[PDB]
Swiss-Prot record:
Site (Fine-tunes the proton-transfer properties of H-64): Y4, N59, N64
Effect noted on mutating N64L: Reduced activity
Leftover remarks: Target of drugs used in treatments against glaucoma disorder and breast cancer.
Taxonomic source organism: Homo sapiens
Effect the entry attributes to changing P198A: Normal CO(2) hydrase activity, but impaired stability
Consequence when changing H61W: Impaired activity, rescued by 4-methylimidazole (4-MI). Impaired activity, not rescued by 4-methylimidazole (4-MI)
Protein name, entry field: Carbonic anhydrase 2
Regulation: Activated by X-ray, histamine, L-adrenaline, L- and D-phenylalanine, L- and D-histidine, L-His-OMe and beta-Ala-His (carnosine).
Main location: cytoplasm
Domain Alpha-carbonic anhydrase per the UniProt entry, residue ranges: 1-256
Cofactor(s) this protein cannot do without: Zn(2+); Co(2+)
Keywords per UniProt: Acetylation, Cell membrane, Cytoplasm, Disease variant, Lyase, Membrane, Metal-binding, Osteopetrosis, Phosphoprotein, Zinc
Length: 257
């Protein structure tokens, strides 16, 4: 039932998932001036050399590219984290227009899209158990701006036509997520939540300072996807982002400057 429309959008989610109004919801506006620099933060460690992509799915909310997380093959560590977190999937949120689409904002600025590389703490054994823990997930958020193409994204954009409607999936092997990373790993970090129901407060958010550039044609193809299932009426998959939520009693830390 939840979705991104007038009748089932972010403003309605609290009725099914009361934690929507909780103490550590995501996303948030990142006020770059009042984020606290912390020289004790470690560089982020992104080890994606052995990543095994498997499949791409349209789940009716976004598309997920999933990875084999049954061994430590693509891991996030270091940065603000004490655990090791295995990459399970990445997905994006995007807008109907280049002027919006990101979930996190930076000094109130919206980006055309936001990538989320979702990782779970190896100490909880699997994704389902990790989401039930305040330190279960580490999500690496990367902003997309529209400009030059990101060559490393194109293999993704080119399969979208095969997963147009809700429920479709396609084989998606040998995709290297290192081709989606900006040059710098400088980051902001804060404790927060999934940005979709069930909105569980289990995420350490690591949002990179440097956006990647993608072309207008690349983002255009995201917007040709559908929220509906095949042979139901066409509802374009656009604006699948949750707006910024109150920061409440949290401090955003910066690894830099
Ligand atoms: C998250 C889970 C429970 C697998 C799920 C359930 C659901 O009903 N709909 C969706 S769609 C969004 C999504 O798959 C997902 C998974 C993990 C994370 Cl951390 C995030 S986010 N948007 O916080 O990064 C989204 N996902
Ligand atoms: Na262009
Ligand atoms: Zn997300």
């Amino acid at each position: 039932h939840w979705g991104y429309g007038k009748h089932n959008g972010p403003e309605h989610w609290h009725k099914d998932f009361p934690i929507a109004k909780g103490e550590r919801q995501s996303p948030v506006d990142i006020d770059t001036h009042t984020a606290k620099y912390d020289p004790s933060l470690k560089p982020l460690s992104v080890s994606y050399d052995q990543a095994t992509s498997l499949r791409i799915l349209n789940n009716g909310h976004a598309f997920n590219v999933e990875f084999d997380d049954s061994q430590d093959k693509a891991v996030l560590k270091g940065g603000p984290l004490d655990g090791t977190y295995r990459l399970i999937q990445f997905h994006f949120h995007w807008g109907s227009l280049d002027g919006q689409g990101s979930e996190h904002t930076v000094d109130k600025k919206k980006y055309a899209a936001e990538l989320h590389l979702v990782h779970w703490n190896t100490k909880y054994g699997d994704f389902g158990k990790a989401v039930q823990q305040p330190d279960g997930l580490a999500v690496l958020g990367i902003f997309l701006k529209v400009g030059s193409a990101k060559p490393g994204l194109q293999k993704v954009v080119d399969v979208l036509d095969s997963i147009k409607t809700k429920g479709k999936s396609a084989d998606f092997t040998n995709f290297d997520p290192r081709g989606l990373l900006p040059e710098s790993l400088d980051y902001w970090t804060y404790p927060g939540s999934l940005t979709t129901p069930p909105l569980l407060e289990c995420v350490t958010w690591i949002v990179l300072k440097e956006p990647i550039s993608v072309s207008s044609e690349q983002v255009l193809k995201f917007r040709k996807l559908n929220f509906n299932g095949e042979g139901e009426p066409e509802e374009l998959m656009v604006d699948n982002w949750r707006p910024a939520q109150p920061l409440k009693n949290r401090q955003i830390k910066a690894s830099f400057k």
